[PDB]
Design an enzyme around this catalytic site. Structure first.
Site, PDB file in Angstrom:
ATOM      1  N   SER B  83     -43.195  -4.582 -31.288  1.00 52.85           N
ATOM      2  CA  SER B  83     -43.573  -3.184 -31.043  1.00 52.85           C
ATOM      3  C   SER B  83     -43.657  -2.836 -29.571  1.00 52.85           C
ATOM      4  O   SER B  83     -43.674  -1.669 -29.197  1.00 52.85           O
ATOM      5  CB  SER B  83     -44.945  -2.919 -31.655  1.00 52.85           C
ATOM      6  OG  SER B  83     -44.986  -3.390 -32.991  1.00 52.85           O
ATOM      7  N   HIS B  86     -42.348  -6.420 -24.696  1.00 52.53           N
ATOM      8  CA  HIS B  86     -42.482  -7.837 -24.430  1.00 52.53           C
ATOM      9  C   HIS B  86     -41.136  -8.539 -24.632  1.00 52.53           C
ATOM     10  O   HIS B  86     -40.645  -9.257 -23.763  1.00 52.53           O
ATOM     11  CB  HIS B  86     -43.499  -8.448 -25.386  1.00 52.53           C
ATOM     12  CG  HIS B  86     -43.716  -9.898 -25.156  1.00 52.53           C
ATOM     13  ND1 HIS B  86     -44.313 -10.385 -24.016  1.00 52.53           N
ATOM     14  CD2 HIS B  86     -43.430 -10.975 -25.926  1.00 52.53           C
ATOM     15  CE1 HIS B  86     -44.396 -11.704 -24.094  1.00 52.53           C
ATOM     16  NE2 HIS B  86     -43.869 -12.083 -25.244  1.00 52.53           N
TER      17      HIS B  86
END
Lengths: 150, 151, 148, 150, 147
Positions: B83, B86
């Site tokens: 989400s 990263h």
């Protein structure tokens, strides 16, 4: 801008990956034929090596130029965008790797990596289907840089 | 002929992350089995080390090749888009780091990092659900690069 | 989980932007190291820098002064209105990797690169989330140990 | 965390580009005023240099820290997304360059580069139109890193 | 009012898209001569086949001769593949690296555009501003500050 570049004593290294051989073969052929036929490079002065994939191009080249002396190197590979993000990340790393090897070594490294969306694009850039063989351009580039490096 | 490349004397290091073990295990197994059965690499000559996540892959490898001598290394990890951003930033840094460790050290580093959108893509690339185990390809690449490094 | 590092010296460098998320992450990393890996409270140095941009330099400077078996660089970057987030996220992540590779000291990425604060708090263990600092603490212990 | 950081003996270098001076000037001013008024840095201990554009920031800084000794450096520039891909490529390269110069030299380099979509965003971050002057944050960061580098 | 009568400047340019390259190089040269008093004999101009070769061409040349500054000029136009994105990024990084490694100011003269029109426009044609002029002045300024 030069015109008639001849490198009869140039030693050229071509390292190519083996993924997508249908596009790789014409590219290597075009680079070789152009160097020989158009720049008088000697066939015996052209070493051609292969690595499994584009990822290995920088290391393949780095290893070879540490062993022998070359006036220029052409790294050839064909990366086609797939379903994951693999294409984006390795394309970037390989291009950076190729640049780095050239800059670290002082040996001209010619980018012969196609980074396309699909096979048709690769074939088109290898001279098939009415396209222009980019390998020819890389061959002339290698000769020119090799000469300028001397 | 990749299949005719034998590396009975090659010392291969496999460093793998431990995130997404369902995909990691078949990848590691595929690489090892391929090296052994198809390239005559000796099981005793294959060191397998793990690190917590893909982020640690370059450092784990760098540390290990400074300790022992290896002819080739395979860095294995599976990064799945989440989400946040990263995934994008570490995928990029890890791939660069792996390339860097290889170039800095002169030791062939085979990229065994899956950078996928979801777990199904990872499993598929680990040879599950009708897919092809990419670990096999990495095993063969490591052997070929290892050999070309000596000779 | 049975990794103990009673003699490990760990450095945690954290940025100070978004302290609501930073605090729990640091706390979780420290608690996890002490309680679960037997790292000693006096062997954990915690330093801070103003923002994530300074993480690589703060770490490089510190590991040049003292000897640490591992370092955790913690920061929280939240996507904003400009392209700042994208460029510094990439530069900091690259910088942290570089400092680790240059120094040989394991550097654990404790940088959250999120779209909004809710995602950062969630990853700091708040609101039903999992505290990623715990994972970093364990990762640091493990890497510190493997660096023998 | 720290309370009241004072660096009366700090020597600070500010290198700033000259593109988009409407935004640059307040940034530099905010950084300088903040260091002086809030951290007790001496005006005569702050060297301010300029380079034509953001591209020249890494090199300008590298050159200066090779000549003189500074406790910290702030590189200031404003890149605004244009019609081409120039913005994307140089933003990345300059940010990387700045991080590199700092890590290479061991001298804290504070990023004072705005990478915005339009001029409004730049002025806003320079403290105009109700915005917060980011230069102030950079001045404080420089002092803090300068002090920690001791 | 920056004058660099004793500056030695190197311009390395690719040969892709010569319609745009020529005016850029010409603008950089004319600007340095006319505006900064750089001497014609002190400007070396070399070329390489493509933008990809710019960092290597520059690195090789500054290893051979001594220059106060370098301008690498090239024009990359987005094509049908991802070639444009990957090489623009590597060449820009390459140029930044060569400058930082060598200590010689390298001025970025690479146009990374979506189409030829944008390139020609930034080369001073069709009512645009010749960016080469700016690069010529930047090179002079950086060459001087490096002394």
């Amino acid at each position: 801008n030069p015109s008639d570049l001849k490198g009869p004593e140039l030693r050229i290294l071509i390292v190519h990956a083996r993924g997508n051989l249908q596009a790789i073969e014409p590219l290597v052929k075009g680079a070789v034929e152009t160097m020989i036929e158009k720049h008088d490079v000697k066939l015996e002065n052209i070493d051609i090596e292969s690595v499994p994939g584009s990822w290995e191009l920088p290391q393949g080249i780095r290893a070879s130029i540490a062993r022998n002396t070359y006036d220029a190197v052409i790294g050839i590979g064909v990366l086609i965008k797939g379903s994951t993000m693999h294409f984006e990340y390795i394309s970037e790393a390989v291009v950076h790797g190729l640049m780095r090897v050239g800059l670290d070594s002082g040996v001209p490294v010619i980018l012969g990596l196609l980074t396309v969306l699909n096979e048709e694009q690769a074939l088109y850039r290898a001279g098939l289907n009415g396209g222009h063989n980019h390998g020819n351009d890389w061959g002339s580039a290698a000769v020119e840089m090799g000469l300028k490096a001397l």
